[PDB]
C-alpha cells in the first residue's frame, strides 16, 4: 500500500530526518523564520505604529522588528486574502499581516517540532522526556504571544517580534502590570535562574571529578563513547558537596530528573502569571500598604517607591506607545520629581 | 600531644569533618554568621533608614509595616557615601540604625565570606585529590554579588546606590538602573540573559535526554529511580541512545557523543555568560552604558522617525523623572 | 513501593474500583455545587437588581442557575425583581437541595462499587481476566449523550417541555427566561443569537445519536486499534483531556 511506502520514504534515515511530523514542521518553521527575516529588512511599521522597523529604513539588528498590527484590526487573523488586505500583498504588509503570519505559522511549527521529538523518540525507542520538557516553551509562546493579547484589546499589545521591540514589552509590563511583583513571575525566574545554576554547577562538578583514563592533560579524548564505567567519580562528588554545602546528590537518575523539573516548572509558572495578566488580573498592589500610605505621609517602603516609578513609565510612555488613543498630556500634568 | 597547634591544623584541615571547616573556613564561618545574624535581626526589627541622605527614612523591616515581598535591609545613607561606617563610628546605635549602618556590616561580611567560600571550594577539592576549577564556576555568581554590592557603589560614589537587601528593593535597583544606564540595550546584559536562558535551556536538554535514555532495571510499578545504586561501576543511561535520538532531532554533527565535552559545554555556557553580565554591571558602574539609538533614523526633511529604541526611551524617562522625588536640586543627574 | 504521585494507578485495570472512584468524584463535584449554592443564598442580596445585581456580589454559581430557568427563591423574591411569583419546587433552594442529595446517593453507590469490585461484568469471558471493551463503550455513552443533548435543545430551550433560557436585549435591560425557537439559517452560527444554541443541540444531538449507533455497531479498523493503542484505557484519558481542555479554552473565550 502506498501509505506504508509514503511512510517508508519519510522515516528514512537521512542527514536531516524528515518524518511525518516534518510535513507540518518544515513548511511552517521555514515560513516563520522567513517572514521574520523578511520584515526585519523590508517591511515597515509606519502605518501600524508610526515606527521605522526595517533595515531598509535604517534600523540596526537591535532596533529592527516585525511590529504588531494596528489596534483597529482588533484580534483579526489578518489573512492575506481576508477583508483587510483583500488579497493584496503590499497592503497586507503595511497592515501588519506579517505578524499574524509569523505568529500563527511559528505556532504550528512548535506543534510540529514537539511531534517530531515524539515521533523520533518512538522510532529510536527512547522515552519522550524531551517532549514533556518542550511543553514549557510551548506554554510560554502560547500564553504570551496568543493568550495574552487575546485578552487585551487586540494583537497590537502582543510582543512585537524584534530585539528592542521586546524590551518595551518588558518595561511595559513593569510599568502597567507591575509584573516583577507577581508570585508567578518570581517562581518563573527562580526556575530559569535556578535552572541555569544546576546547568553550570553540574557541568563543573563533572569536569573536576573525572577519573584519569588517559595520559594527556586535555582529558577530552580520554572518553569512552561506548559506555562501561562512570566517567566521573559520582562517589567523590557526593562527598565534596556533602562537606561544602551540607547537602549533595547521590542518585544520578534523580539529579537528572531534577534538572528537567526545575526549569520546566519555572516556565510553566511564569505562564500562568501572564494568562492572568491577559484579563489584567495582575498582582499590582498590597492593599494594607496603600491604606497606611494614604493616612500616614511618612510611611515609605521600597514598594511605594516602585509604584511611583510605574506612574512615570505609564505617563511618559503611553503617548507614543498607544498612538490609537490620541493621547495629549500637557507638560503640567506629567508627574516629575524635583529638578529632573 | 603531638603538638597542639600541629593538631589544630590537622583538625581544621581534616577531611573527616561533617562540614569541611577549612583554612578559608576560619574566616568564612565567622564573617558569614555575623552577616546572617545581623541581617535576620535587621530584616525583622530594624527601624527606618535615610537611604538618600535627605532625611526621608525608608522603613523596610517586618515589624515596621513590611511583608516578606516588600521588606528589605536598606542601604547606608548617601550622606555617608563611600565612607566606612562601623558601629564604633556612631554616637549611638540609634544613630547607626538611622544612617543604615547594618547594611555595611552585612555586605562587607557577606562579600568577605562568600569569597572564602570560593577559597574553600578549592581547598576541599585539593584535600580530596579532585581537579580544582569548580570554584571557578562559582566565581561568576560571586563576581555578580561583588558587582551589585561593591563595584557599582564604588563606581557611583556611594553605598546608598548598591542593591538593597530585599525583594522589592531589588526591583527598585533594576528599574532605576535601566533608566540611568539603559542596560537592556547593552551587549553584556544580553550575553547575560543568553547564558541564563541558555543555561535553563541546556539544563532541561541534558536533564531530559539523560533521564529519557535510562537503562531499564525497575518494575512497571516501581520508582524508575531505584534503578541506580550509590557507588556504581558502569553508567546508568545509554549515552549512545541519547546521542542517537538527539542527533536525529537536529542532525548528527550538531550533537554530543562525548560526555566530557557535553559537560564542559554545560558548565562553560552559563558561567561565561554570567561573567559578562557581572562585567556589565561592573562596567556600567563607570557610566559606559548601553547603545543610545535615540533619534537615529530621521527622514528626508530632518523629521525624527521613531524606532522601538525611542519607545524604550520614553519608558526610561518616566523612571528617570520619577525616581528619588525629592533628592535632586539640579538639571543633570550626575550621581 | 509506589511513589506518592502514582497511588491512583492501583485502578488502571480494576473497572470496579475505577467506577467506585469516579463515583466519589462525581459525589464531591455534585456536593460542592449544592453547597456553593447555599453559600450564595445565605449571602446574596435580592433587594436591588438594578444597581446591586448578582454580578456585583461575587456570585459565581447563581448565574449559571438563571441562565437555564431557575430564577426564584422559595422565600418569595426573584432574579428579575418580581414578587408574588411561585417558583414551585425548582427554586435556587430546590436546585441546591437536589444536588446535596444526588451527592449522598452517589456516595453510597461509590461505597457499594468499592466492596463489590469483582463483578463478573468486568472479566472477559475469553481470557477470564479483567477487561473493558472501550470502543463499544464509547459508542454507547456517545449515544446517550446525543440523546440527552437532543432532548435539552428539543424540549428545554424551546419551551416544549421546559423553561427556556436567559434572553435579553442589546443592552441588558430587559433580560429574562424565555422559550427560544431553533435557527438553522446561517445567522444561527452567530455567537450572539440564542436560536443558534437551540439548533446546535438538536442537530448535534441527532448527529450524536447517529454516530453513537455507528460506534455501537462498526468495529475499529485494526490499523487504528493498533496505532491509538485502544483497549488500553490510559489512552481514552489522553484523548478526553485533549477534548476537555479544548472545551475549556472555548468557554473562556466566550
Amino acid at each position: 500500500g502506498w501509505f506504508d511506502i509514503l511512510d517508508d520514504w519519510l522515516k528514512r534515515d537521512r542527514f536531516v530526518f524528515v518524518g511525518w511530523s516534518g510535513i507540518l514542521l518544515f513548511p511552517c518553521a521555514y515560513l516563520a523564520l522567513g517572514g521574520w527575516l523578511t520584515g526585519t529588512t523590508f517591511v515597515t511599521s509606519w502605518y501600524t505604529h508610526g515606527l521605522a522597523s526595517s533595515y531598509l529604513e535604517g534600523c540596526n539588528f537591535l532596533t529592527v522588528a516585525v511590529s504588531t498590527p494596528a489596534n483597529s484590526m482588533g484580534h483579526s487573523l489578518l489573512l492575506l486574502w481576508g477583508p483587510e488586505a483583500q488579497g493584496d500583498f503590499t497592503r497586507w504588509c503595511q497592515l501588519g499581516g506579517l505578524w499574524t503570519f509569523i505568529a500563527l505559522h511559528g505556532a504550528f511549527g512548535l506543534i510540529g517540532f514537539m511531534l517530531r521529538q515524539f515521533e523520533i523518540a518512538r522510532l529510536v525507542g527512547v522515552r519522550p522526556y524531551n517532549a514533556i520538557a518542550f511543553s514549557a516553551p510551548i506554554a510560554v509562546f502560547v500564553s504570551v504571544f496568543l493568550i495574552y493579547p487575546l485578552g487585551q484589546s487586540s494583537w497590537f499589545f502582543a510582543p512585537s517580534f524584534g530585539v528592542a521591540a521586546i524590551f518595551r514589552f518588558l518595561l511595559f509590563f513593569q510599568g502597567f502590570h507591575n509584573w516583577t511583583l507577581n508570585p508567578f513571575h518570581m517562581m518563573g525566574v527562580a526556575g530559569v535562574l535556578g535552572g541555569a545554576l544546576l546547568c553550570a554547577i553540574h557541568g563543573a562538578t563533572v569536569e573536576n571529578t573525572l577519573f584519569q583514563d588517559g595520559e594527556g592533560a586535555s582529558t577530552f579524548r580520554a572518553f569512552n563513547p561506548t559506555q562501561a564505567e562512570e566517567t566521573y567519580s559520582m562517589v567523590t562528588a557526593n562527598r565534596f558537596w556533602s562537606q561544602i554545602f551540607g547537602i549533595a546528590f547521590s542518585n544520578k537518575r534523580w539529579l537528572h530528573f531534577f534538572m528537567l523539573f526545575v526549569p520546566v516548572t519555572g516556565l510553566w509558572m511564569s505562564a500562568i502569571g501572564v494568562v492572568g495578566l491577559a484579563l489584567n488580573l495582575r498582582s499590582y498592589d498590597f492593599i494594607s500598604q496603600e491604606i497606611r500610605a494614604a493616612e500616614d505621609p511618612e510611611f515609605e517602603t521600597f514598594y511605594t517607591k516602585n509604584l511611583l516609578l510605574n506612574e512615570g513609565i505609564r505617563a511618559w510612555m503611553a503617548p507614543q506607545d498607544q498612538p490609537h488613543e490620541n493621547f495629549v498630556f500637557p507638560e503640567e500634568v506629567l508627574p516629575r520629581g524635583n529638578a529632573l | 600531644s603531638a603538638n597542639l597547634w600541629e593538631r589544630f591544623c590537622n583538625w581544621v584541615t581534616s577531611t573527616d569533618n561533617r562540614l569541611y571547616v577549612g583554612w578559608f573556613g576560619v574566616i568564612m564561618i565567622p564573617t558569614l554568621l555575623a552577616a546572617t545574624i545581623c541581617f535576620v535581626i535587621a530584616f525583622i526589627a530594624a527601624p527606618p533608614v535615610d537611604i538618600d541622605g535627605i532625611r526621608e527614612p525608608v522603613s523596610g523591616s517586618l515589624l515596621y509595616g513590611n511583608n516578606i515581598i516588600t521588606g528589605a535591609v536598606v542601604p547606608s545613607s548617601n550622606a555617608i557615601g563611600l565612607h566606612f561606617y562601623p558601629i564604633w563610628e556612631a554616637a549611638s546605635l540609634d544613630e547607626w540604625l538611622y544612617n543604615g549602618g547594618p547594611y555595611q556590616l552585612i555586605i562587607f561580611h557577606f562579600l568577605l565570606g562568600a569569597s572564602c567560600y570560593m577559597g574553600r571550594q578549592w581547598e576541599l577539592s585539593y584535600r580530596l585529590g579532585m581537579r580544582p576549577w569548580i570554584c571557578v564556576a562559582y566565581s561568576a555568581p560571586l563576581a555578580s554579588a561583588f558587582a551589585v554590592f561593591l563595584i557599582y557603589p564604588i563606581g557611583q560614589g556611594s553605598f546608598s546606590d548598591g542593591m538593597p537587601l530585599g525583594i522589592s528593593g531589588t526591583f527598585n535597583f533594576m528599574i532605576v538602573f535601566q533608566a540611568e544606564h539603559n542596560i537592556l540595550m547593552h551587549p553584556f546584559h544580553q550575553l547575560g540573559v543568553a547564558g541564563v536562558f541558555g543555561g535553563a535551556l541546556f539544563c532541561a536538554m541534558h536533564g531530559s535526554l539523560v533521564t529519557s535514555s535510562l537503562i531499564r532495571e525497575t518494575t512497571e510499578t516501581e520508582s524508575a529511580n531505584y534503578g541506580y545504586k550509590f557507588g556504581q561501576e558502569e553508567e546508568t543511561y545509554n549515552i549512545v541512545a541519547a546521542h542517537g535520538y538527539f542527533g536525529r532531532l537536529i542532525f548528527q554533527y550538531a550533537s554530543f557523543n562525548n560526555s566530557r565535552s557535553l559537560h564542559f559545554f554545560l558548565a562553560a555556557w552559563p558561567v561565561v555568560g554570567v561573567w559578562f553580565t557581572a562585567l556589565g554591571i561592573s562596567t556600567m558602574a563607570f557610566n559606559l552604558n548601553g547603545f543610545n539609538f535615540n533619534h537615529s533614523v530621521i527622514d528626508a526633511k530632518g523629521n525624527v522617525i521613531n524606532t522601538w529604541a525611542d519607545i524604550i526611551n520614553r519608558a526610561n524617562l518616566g523612571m528617570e523623572v520619577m525616581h528619588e522625588r525629592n533628592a535632586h536640586n539640579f538639571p543633570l543627574d550626575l550621581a | 513501593g509506589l511513589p506518592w504521585y502514582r497511588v491512583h494507578t492501583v485502578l488502571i485495570n480494576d473497572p470496579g474500583r475505577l467506577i467506585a472512584a469516579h463515583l466519589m468524584h462525581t459525589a464531591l463535584v455534585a456536593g460542592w455545587a449544592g453547597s456553593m449554592a447555599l453559600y450564595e443564598l445565605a449571602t446574596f442580596d435580592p433587594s436591588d437588581p438594578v444597581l446591586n445585581p448578582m454580578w456585583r456580589q461575587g456570585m459565581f454559581v447563581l448565574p449559571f442557575m438563571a441562565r437555564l430557568g431557575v430564577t426564584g427563591s422559595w422565600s418569595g423574591w426573584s432574579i428579575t425583581g418580581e414578587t408574588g411569583i411561585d417558583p414551585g419546587f425548582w427554586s435556587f433552594e430546590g436546585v441546591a437541595l437536589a444536588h446535596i442529595v444526588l451527592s449522598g446517593l452517589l456516595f453510597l453507590a461509590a461505597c457499594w462499587h468499592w466492596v463489590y469490585w469483582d463483578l463478573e461484568l468486568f472479566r472477559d469471558p475469553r481470557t477470564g481476566e479483567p477487561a473493558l471493551d472501550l470502543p463499544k463503550m464509547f459508542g454507547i455513552h456517545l449515544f446517550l449523550a446525543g440523546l440527552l443533548c437532543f432532548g435539552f435543545g428539543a424540549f428545554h430551550l424551546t419551551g416544549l417541555f421546559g423553561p427556556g433560557m436567559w434572553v435579553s436585549d442589546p443592552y441588558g435591560l430587559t433580560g429574562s427566561v424565555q422559550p427560544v425557537a431553533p435557527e438553522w439559517g446561517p445567522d444561527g452560527f452567530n455567537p450572539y443569537n440564542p436560536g443558534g444554541v437551540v439548533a446546535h443541540h438538536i442537530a448535534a444531538g441527532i448527529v450524536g445519536i447517529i454516530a453513537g449507533l455507528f460506534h455501537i455497531l462498526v468495529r475499529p479498523p485494526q490499523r487504528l486499534y493498533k496505532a491509538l493503542r485502544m483497549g488500553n484505557i490510559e489512552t481514552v484519558l489522553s484523548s478526553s483531556i485533549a477534548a476537555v481542555f479544548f472545551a475549556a479554552f472555548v468557554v473562556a473565550g466566550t
Binding site: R122, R127, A131, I272 | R216, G227 | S238, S239, I241
Partner: peptide, 27 residues
C-alpha cells in the same frame, strides 16, 4: 493550559508504555 500538559503527558505515556521503566540493548 494546565490540562494541555496532562494530555501531552498521558498521551506520551500511552504511546511509549513499552519503553517506560527504561530501555535496552543493541547499538
Amino acid at each position: 493550559l494546565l490540562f494541555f500538559f496532562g494530555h501531552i503527558w498521558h498521551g506520551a505515556r500511552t504511546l511509549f508504555r513499552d519503553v517506560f521503566s527504561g530501555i535496552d540493548p543493541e547499538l
